[PDB]
Symmetry: none
Subunit: 75 residues, 6 copies
Amino acid sequence: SVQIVYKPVDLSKVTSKCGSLGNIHHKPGGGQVEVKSEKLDFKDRVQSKIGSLDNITHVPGGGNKKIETHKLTFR
Amino acid sequence: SVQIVYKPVDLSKVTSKCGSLGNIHHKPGGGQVEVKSEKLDFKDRVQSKIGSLDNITHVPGGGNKKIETHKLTFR
Amino acid sequence: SVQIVYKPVDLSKVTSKCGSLGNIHHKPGGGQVEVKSEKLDFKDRVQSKIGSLDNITHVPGGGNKKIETHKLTFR
Amino acid sequence: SVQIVYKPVDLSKVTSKCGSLGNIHHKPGGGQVEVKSEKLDFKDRVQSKIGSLDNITHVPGGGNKKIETHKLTFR
Amino acid sequence: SVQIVYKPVDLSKVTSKCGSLGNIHHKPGGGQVEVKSEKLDFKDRVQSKIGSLDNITHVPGGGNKKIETHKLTFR
Amino acid sequence: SVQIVYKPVDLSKVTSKCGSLGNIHHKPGGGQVEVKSEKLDFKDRVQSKIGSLDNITHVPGGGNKKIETHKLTFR
């Protein structure tokens, strides 16, 4: 016979404290972009991106990430 | 017979304290980008990126990452 | 007695010839300007300029400048 | 007695010839300008300029400058 | 008595010939300018310039400058 | 008595010939400029320049400069 007894006790306090978050600045792609193309012979799929893209400013006042997994496999 | 007894006790305090977070600056791609292309013969898939891209500013006032795994395998 | 005889003969051909003037480009102030000012105590006249200003494109298809002076002073 | 005889003969051909003037580019102030000022105590006149200014593109297809002076002074 | 006889003969051909003027580029102030000032106590006139300024592209397809002076002084 | 006889004969051909003027490039101030100033006590006039300035590209397809002077002084 199999007897399995499980007690994960977790009182964990993933805590943060800031008095003043601020005065944050993010200036991507300030300058000039210039592209000039002539006499191109493509013979397969193409992608192109030009400019400012995908520019993130994540400012999480908390930003307390917590991750938890319980796998319990039985054969 | 199999007897398994489990007591993970966790009171862990992943803590942070800041008086003043600030005056943070992020200036990617200040200067000028210039591209000039002539007489290119491509014969397979292409990708191109030009400019400021994928520029992150993560400013987590906490930023307390916690990660936890419990695998319990039985044969 | 005074005798003064004057014959400025001028057949001068200040000439220009262009087959095709073109494909001219002028891009001043491409990038970003940013100004930030705090706690300034001025006690006299002020001037300020910010940005793109006074940006000339002179494209004279001729542009044949000619200048001519005749002073004739008598005492 | 005074006798003065004057014959400036000028057939001068200040000439220019271009087949194709073109493909001219002028990109001043591509990048980013940034200014930050705090606690300044001025006690006399001020001037300030920021950015792209006074940026010339003179493209005279001729551009044949000619200058001529005749002073004739008599005492 | 004074006899003065004057014959400046000038057939001078200040000439230029270009087949193709072009593909000229002028990129001043590509990069980033940054200025940061604190606690300045001025007590006389001030001037300031920041950025791209006074950037010339003279492209005279001719550009044939000619200069001529005739002083004729009599006592 | 004074007799003065003057014959400046000038057939001078200040000439130029170019087949193709081109592919000229001028990139001043590519890099980054940075200035940081604290606790300055000026007590007389000031000037300041920062960045790309006064950057010339003269491309005269001719560029045939000619200069001529005739002083004729009489006592």
